[PDB]
């Protein structure tokens, strides 16, 4: 919200060509999907894609009800009771290498401005052996330690991916925000030690599916939500952008605070996300509110806010409502409510509408069903398919066809390998149907029994 125009500067090229190309299986399945619109002169749409991206960000909420604060600090108590309040700053060595049971920073990811303009990669700007930034990058990280984030400009561009034909026709393409590499390092310094603990324990108590593995953890999520009377599926609309600047303050003061064992600089880092400066072609602008993408923190941040927001809506809608009445499971804006009560999310939608957040039923029709169970819900594009004492992540049939219909030249073998581990849960008949197009044109893929056996090996 609140997009303020700044003085224009050097041209930072937004890419306007898809790398996606159709496979041999596109003609077979013909999914309701196509590459996202990137150019203004894309003939598949009437609309200007830059206008549609800039039409969003109207204005976030200035204020926010007082119930958001108490439910935030009450959620904080539960989280830090389990994980602990030893969430101090990590060294630059620890940030790059990552802690034990935490992936190291990706060397391939974009380094951000001005390194992308100069044609440099992440491994140019730092030495991973010694954890040593080059003089230019080192002094910028120094200034951010001294409470100054004035140099930080997000490289912003359109997301190259598949979209529904309606999103392609309407030119509604998602926006990627790439922060500078030093900003991304500093983020993992301040919030890394906490993130490592949050990743390792996904479940209903922490209220998060972050750092899970659908093959294994679906059985754990399944059995945990099994005993409950109902399970609701709730989806937000523009969850990242609708975060108010007040929400960021709440997190800094109540959740990611020095009381809970965080670095004092965390507050200033969170303000860099709250009020951020972006570069798009020659345009420069300033968005007040909403969480930018980029780096590993984004999914965790939304997961924390999601547990707060959904309960705050319930507190507002349902009087004498309890915190433990609802058990939550979420991976960012993908939300899953488990409860013994009977909740009406039509009235919760109207409550949260006033607070800025917009929920939807996730079933293409404006009616949250009063009755809903574990078998009905869809979480992470997957369903909960019980099989003996286990649960299998059965992925949507229309999703699987869409994934196989397009690809990026060069990395086709890597793609097919990963999709076999998804399609295995749909059954041998469905499995061999989905890969038949590729085998038809002389492309070998592993047997169903090979990959099905591999999945069963996880539980031995």
Numbering used by the authors: 1 to 460
What does the paper say about this structure?
For this, 3Dpol uses the viral protein 3B, in this context usually termed VPg (viral protein genome-linked), as a primer. Crystal structures have been reported of 3Dpol of the enteroviruses CVB3, PV, EV71, HRV1B, HRV14, and HRV16, and of the aphthovirus FMDV.
Interestingly, the three virus pools each contained a single missense mutation compared to wild-type (wt) virus. The 3Dpol I304V mutant crystallized in the space group C2 with six polymerase molecules per a.u. and diffracted to 3.2 Å resolution. Structural comparisons showed that the mutant polymerases were almost identical to the wt enzyme. The substitutions of the methionine and isoleucine side chains by the shorter valine in the mutants imply a weakening of these hydrophobic interactions. This could result in an increased flexibility of α10, including the disruption of the last helical turn, and of the B-loop, which appears to have a key role in GPC-N114 binding in EMCV 3Dpol. In contrast, I304 seems to be located relatively far away of the GPC-N114 binding cavity.
